Design a protein around this ligand. Structure first.
Ligand SMILES: Nc1ncnc2c1ncn2[C@@H]1O[C@H](COP(=O)(O)O)[C@@H](O)[C@H]1O
Length: 448
């Protein structure tokens, strides 16, 4: 033998440490955002619609094929990302149909809840119920083990059209300086959480062991009154689920502070578990009180100590307390180069294996391998780090043979592991959802 890489050493230590919990979930219910992502060359699609190259010109809303072409060309010229709503329902149906039927277009399960459901459904001894706007194409795309109530099945899908360009790509006088994507949809269902009622209604019959909720972020840009009605529906529904059934909230893509504030005040006390990334974590700290709210943005890899101070603060401010009657005891934090599982002591088991398992799926799914291919991964976490900078914390050094690190702070325990980052990834949209689902699958709640 020669010396093995840090990455091979790390993946070997995971393989030994990872095992399912003693008591396993039988049934998990997941809702409510779901769609079909159609990934297609934008130039090819527009050409396929019979369009000649016009002018690049931004449009706030796309009402027409013209508007679509013009805004696409505008962003393709910048090599920049954008997202738009397309307002004409019937015209959108014809364009999405054209994109979805275009030879070589890729179709993917989309939506946090559907992606979570899909990951859980990979295990045959776990029964998954999924609600959301599920048409015939999404139903076909979903794993056969996923049960969708007939109530949650509809005639049309919610297509999200993802129009990609490559760096250097050309169409007439247009040339992309960077590779990016322009995305559009006509998705009122996910925007309004229109399947929340159907989801809530299906829980009693199904008797979930675990309920997972996502899609609140999608209400961003809707009536504040509509948002308030839906958050009350969430909280009411959860108070009707039998006591001691964990509820996980998977947080995502938030930019509105009124809404974020409201989710924290109302929904956080009603859930056992929360899942999120660096972007949402920092956004939370910026809204409310924040151990590092002052910082506008993370400057490269988020500092572990700074991250942990925010997670600590959330479980202290909003987590279960003798005064609080909050049910929140768990936060699965996942960023690119490390994941942390933070838990209020004595409510959860198997959290070493669980965080290890969340991290491992980030590698394997990114690379599209069954197991970790140690040639295609790279350890990118900091070699040493402080467990808090605010408080006086430990100085930890990474040991690839002992990758999962545990530390304690006032009845709250943290579980840290680095990620084996896929260097040549296929497609990493939806990775946080697969990470959170894996973390929960390998978690065990205890009696309330
Ligand atoms: N190339 C990669 N290899 C392994 N994990 C990744 C990679 N890229 C992203 N991740 C993780 O996947 C997640 C993407 O989904 P999200 O958290 O929803 O943004 C990030 O949180 C990263 O932690």
């Amino acid at each position: 033998k020669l010396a093995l890489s840090p990455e091979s050493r790390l993946a070997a230590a995971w393989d030994a440490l990872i095992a399912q919990p003693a008591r396993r979930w039988r049934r998990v219910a997941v809702g409510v955002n779901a769609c079909v992502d159609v990934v297609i060359s934008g130039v090819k699609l527009l050409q396929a619609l019979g369009l000649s190259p016009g002018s690049g010109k931004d449009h706030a809303i796309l009402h027409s094929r013209s508007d679509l072409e013009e805004a696409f060309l505008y962003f393709m010229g910048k090599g920049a990302a954008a997202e738009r709503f397309f307002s004409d329902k019937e015209t959108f149906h014809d364009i999405a149909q054209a994109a979805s039927e275009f030879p070589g277009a890729q179709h993917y399960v989309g939506g946090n809840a559907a992606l979570i459901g899909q990951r859980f459904a990979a295990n045959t001894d776990l029964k998954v119920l999924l609600c959301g706007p599920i048409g015939p194409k999404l139903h076909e795309l979903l794993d056969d083990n996923v049960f969708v109530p007939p109530e949650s099945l509809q005639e049309e899908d919610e297509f999200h059209l993802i129009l990609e360009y490559l760096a250097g790509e050309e169409w007439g006088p247009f040339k992309a300086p960077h590779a990016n994507r322009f995305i559009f949809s006509h998705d009122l269902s996910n925007g309004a959480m229109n399947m929340l009622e159907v989801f809530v209604s299906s829980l009693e019959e199904f008797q979930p062991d675990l309920v997972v909720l996502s899609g609140l972020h999608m209400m961003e840009g809707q009536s504040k009154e509509l948002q308030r009605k839906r958050l009350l529906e969430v909280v009411t529904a959860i108070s009707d689920i039998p006591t001691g059934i964990p509820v996980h909230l998977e947080l995502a893509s938030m930019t509105n502070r009124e809404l974020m504030s409201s989710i924290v005040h109302q929904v956080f006390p009603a859930v056992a578990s929360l899942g999120l990334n660096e972007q949402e974590l920092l956004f939370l700290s910026q809204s409310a009180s924040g151990p590092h709210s002052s910082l506008s943005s993370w400057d490269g890899v988020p500092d572990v100590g700074m991250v942990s101070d925010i997670l600590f603060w959330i479980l202290k401010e909003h987590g279960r307390s003798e005064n609080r009657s909050s049910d929140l005891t768990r936060i699965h934090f996942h960023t690119l180069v490390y994941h942390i599982l933070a838990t209020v002591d004595g409510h959860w088991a198997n959290q070493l294996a669980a965080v290890a398992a969340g991290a491992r799926v980030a590698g394997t799914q990114a690379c599209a391998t069954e197991t970790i291919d140690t040639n295609r991964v790279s350890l990118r976490a900091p070699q040493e780090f402080t467990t808090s900078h605010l408080e006086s914390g430990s100085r930890i050094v990474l040991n690839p043979d002992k990758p999962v690190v545990e530390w304690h702070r006032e009845g709250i325990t943290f579980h840290f592991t680095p990620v084996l980052v896929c260097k040549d990834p296929v497609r990493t949209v939806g990775l946080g959802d697969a990470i959170s689902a894996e973390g929960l699958f390998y978690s065990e709640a205890r009696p309330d």
